[PDB]
C-alpha cells in the first residue's frame, strides 16, 4: 500500500492555494508517479486534478519513502493563473511554445539591428541596382 501524509500545511489566500510537504510511504514499490499523487491529493482535498501541483520528490537513501512539496489551488483558473508555465506543460494544461535556439534568435536580432526602417526600400533599391 501507499500512504500520503501532508505536513507543515499553510493556507495562502494571497496566491489562493494551500502549501504543504507531502511524505509518501510506499513499501515494496520503487516510487509513485506524480500523476497518481496528484489524483490522490485531489481526492483527499476535494479539488480538481488540474488544481493540484506536486514536485521536489527525492526518495531517501534506502528507499521506501519520498518527500516533496505540494500545492492545491482553490480552483483551476487560479492554478492556470499562478502556476509556472513549465509545470503547466508537465501536466498538459498548457502547450510548449516552440522557439528557435538562443543562438539563432540572437543572430536574427543582430541582423535586424543592422537594418534601419522596414527595409522594403532597400529591397527595391538592390533589385533596381542589379
Amino acid at each position: 500500500a501507499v500512504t500520503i501524509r501532508t505536513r507543515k500545511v499553510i493556507s495562502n489566500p494571497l496566491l489562493a492555494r494551500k502549501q504543504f510537504v507531502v511524505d509518501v510511504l510506499h513499501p515494496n514499490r520503487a516510487n509513485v508517479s506524480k500523476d497518481e499523487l496528484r489524483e490522490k491529493l485531489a481526492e483527499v482535498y476535494k479539488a480538481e486534478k488540474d488544481a493540484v501541483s506536486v514536485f521536489g520528490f527525492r526518495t531517501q537513501f534506502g528507499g521506501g519513502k519520498s518527500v516533496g512539496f505540494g500545492l492545491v489551488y482553490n480552483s483551476v483558473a487560479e492554478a492556470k493563473k499562478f502556476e509556472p508555465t513549465y509545470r503547466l506543460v508537465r501536466y498538459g494544461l498548457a502547450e510548449k511554445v516552440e522557439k528557435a535556439s538562443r543562438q539563432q534568435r540572437k543572430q536574427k536580432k543582430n541582423r535586424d539591428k543592422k537594418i534601419f526602417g522596414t527595409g522594403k526600400r532597400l529591397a527595391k533599391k538592390v533589385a533596381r541596382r542589379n
Partner: protein, 258 residues
C-alpha cells in the same frame, strides 16, 4: 565606479536578513525609500524568507501586483521596497497585520498585531525646522514631513503618527525614566529605561539605559528610540520584551520548554 550601484552580492548584504549564502550569487538590493539600505527589510525577504508565503521572487511579484500588500496603509508594488522599523505591513486577504520590530537577537521579527494597534505608528523626530512661508515642520526617522507640529516637540522626541491622516496624535519627550528601544549597535533590540544622558558638545551623545533585570548599558544617542513610559509602552512589544538573556540561561530555558 562611474555612477550609483545597482547590484548587491549576497555576502555583502545585511547580516540580519539571514540569507542563505549558497542559494545564489546576488541578494535583493533595497530600492531608495523611507529607510536606509542597511537598516531596512525589503518586502521580498519578508514575504518569502520570513512568512514563507511565496516560494520564489516571481511569486512575490505576483503577490505585489495583485495589490494585496500595504505598507503604512498605502499599496506598494516594488519587490524591493525598503520596509523598516515601525512600519506596518497589512495583508488584508490573510487578515494579518505586522509591525517590524527587532527581536533580542537583532533581527526583524514577525510580530502580529491587532488592527487598532495597526492604525498608528511611532516616529523619532529627526529634525524640527521652519519651511517656506514660515511653516514649521518635523522630519521623522522614516522621512515623513509633517507640517504644523506641536511647538513643544523637539528633536529626539517621539511622535505617534496616525497612518490614515499622517498627523501627530500625541508625543513623548525624551526624559529620564522613559522607556526606550535600541535600534543600532551590538545592543540592538534591547529595551530599557533612561538613567542619564551624557552630553558632549561637538561629539556623539551617550545614554545610559537600565533594563528590567537591572543590567545597565551605554549606547550612542542616535541608536535610542523612545517608545513610552516605563511599564506603559505605546506599542505591543515582541516576545522576550527586549530582555537580553545569557547563553547559559538560554540553554536552560530551551531544555525546559522542549
Amino acid at each position: 565606479a562611474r555612477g550609483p550601484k545597482k547590484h548587491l552580492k549576497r555576502l555583502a548584504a545585511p547580516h540580519h536578513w539571514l540569507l542563505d549564502k549558497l542559494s545564489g550569487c546576488y541578494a535583493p538590493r533595497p530600492s531608495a525609500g523611507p529607510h536606509k539600505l542597511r537598516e531596512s527589510l525589503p518586502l521580498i525577504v519578508f514575504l518569502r524568507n520570513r512568512l514563507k508565503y511565496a516560494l520564489n521572487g516571481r511569486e512575490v511579484k505576483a503577490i505585489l501586483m495583485q495589490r494585496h500588500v500595504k505598507v503604512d496603509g498605502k499599496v506598494r508594488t516594488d519587490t524591493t521596497y525598503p520596509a523598516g522599523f515601525m512600519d506596518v505591513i497589512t495583508l488584508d486577504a490573510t487578515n494579518e497585520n505586522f509591525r517590524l520590530v527587532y527581536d533580542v537577537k537583532g533581527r526583524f521579527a514577525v510580530h502580529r498585531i491587532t488592527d487598532e494597534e495597526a492604525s498608528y505608528k511611532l516616529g523619532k523626530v529627526k529634525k524640527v525646522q521652519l519651511g517656506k512661508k514660515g511653516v514649521p515642520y518635523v522630519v521623522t526617522h522614516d522621512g515623513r514631513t509633517i507640517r504644523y507640529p506641536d511647538p513643544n516637540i523637539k528633536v529626539n522626541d517621539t511622535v505617534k503618527i496616525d497612518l490614515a491622516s499622517g498627523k501627530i496624535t500625541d508625543f513623548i519627550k525624551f526624559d529620564a525614566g522613559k522607556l526606550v528601544y535600541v535600534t543600532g549597535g551590538r545592543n540592538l533590540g534591547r529595551i530599557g529605561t533612561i538613567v542619564h544622558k551624557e552630553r558632549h558638545d561637538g561629539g556623539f551623545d551617550l545614554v545610559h539605559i537600565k533594563d528590567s533585570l537591572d543590567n545597565t548599558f551605554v549606547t550612542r544617542l542616535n541608536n535610542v528610540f523612545v517608545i513610552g513610559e516605563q511599564g506603559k509602552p505605546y506599542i505591543s512589544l515582541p516576545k522576550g520584551k527586549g530582555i537580553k538573556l545569557s547563553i547559559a540561561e538560554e540553554r536552560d530555558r530551551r531544555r525546559a520548554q522542549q
